[PDB]
Design a protein around this ligand. Structure first.
Ligand SMILES: COc1ncc(NS(C)(=O)=O)cc1/C=C/C1CCC(F)(F)CC1
Length: 211
């Protein structure tokens, strides 16, 4: 009844997320490869995962999942399982878009963790743009962190897909979107990763985090 049908809340919905690479010859004939992609441009509730199970994948720390979930609100917390498409230097980019009925200034933080420990963090702020009665937040074509571009190139070298999955078992990303002015948390997404078989493109499965 009040359980989410997609990644978002009544205050802020994810519209699209993609991590991609455009090869150098895309100026001649445009193409882009999506490593991972969520599009939310009716349905039953999303499935749920108990947040305690994924606590180990994420560090106990200030700004960590356990502390954040305790501060709430619980309904803003999601877990995304990605099967990444690693079958493809070029431009490596990330694009995010959100919507709301409120006019807000968002702070979006992406925390990359390896073996639970935070390795890199990217923090951006985006002001709303009023369009057709609703407010849109566009963080498009952001350059991917060089740590992740380097990690992707090493990962694609591995000779077996199961070795890629072994490495990715210890690799997570935590995305926190907060109201810049109030500091209240609007959306928190935990990401876990596997490699898709070489024949299948990227897919995802979204869960509500409950406790
Ligand atoms: C949720 O993902 C992301 N969120 C945010 C960013 N932002 S950032 C730190 O500024 O780069 C990057 C990613 C990259 C995802 C990659 C990870 C490695 C992969 F699994 F092999 C393919 C997908």
């Amino acid at each position: 009844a009040w359980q989410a049908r997609g990644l978002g809340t009544a205050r802020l919905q994810l519209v699209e997320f993609s991590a991609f690479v455009e090869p150098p010859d895309a100026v001649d004939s445009y193409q882009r490869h999506l490593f991972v992609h969520i599009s939310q441009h009716g349905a039953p509730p999303l499935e749920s995962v108990d947040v305690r199970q994924i606590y180990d994948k994420f560090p106990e720390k200030k700004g960590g999942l356990r502390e954040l979930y305790d501060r709430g609100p619980p309904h803003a917390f999601f877990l995304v399982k990605f099967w990444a498409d690693l079958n493809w230097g070029g431009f490596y980019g990330v694009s995010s878009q959100y919507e709301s009925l409120e006019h807000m200034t968002l702070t979006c933080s992406s925390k990359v963790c390896s073996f639970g420990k935070q390795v890199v963090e990217k923090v951006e702020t985006e002001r709303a743009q009023l369009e057709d009665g609703r407010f849109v937040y566009r963080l498009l074509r952001s350059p991917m962190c060089e740590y992740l571009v380097n990690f992707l190139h090493k990962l694609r070298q591995l000779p077996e897909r199961y070795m890629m999955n072994s490495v990715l078992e210890n690799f997570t990303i935590l995305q926190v979107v907060t109201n810049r002015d109030t500091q209240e948390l609007l959306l928190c997404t935990a990401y876990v990763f596997e490699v898709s078989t070489s024949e299948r493109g990227a897919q995802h499965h979204i869960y509500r985090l409950v406790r």
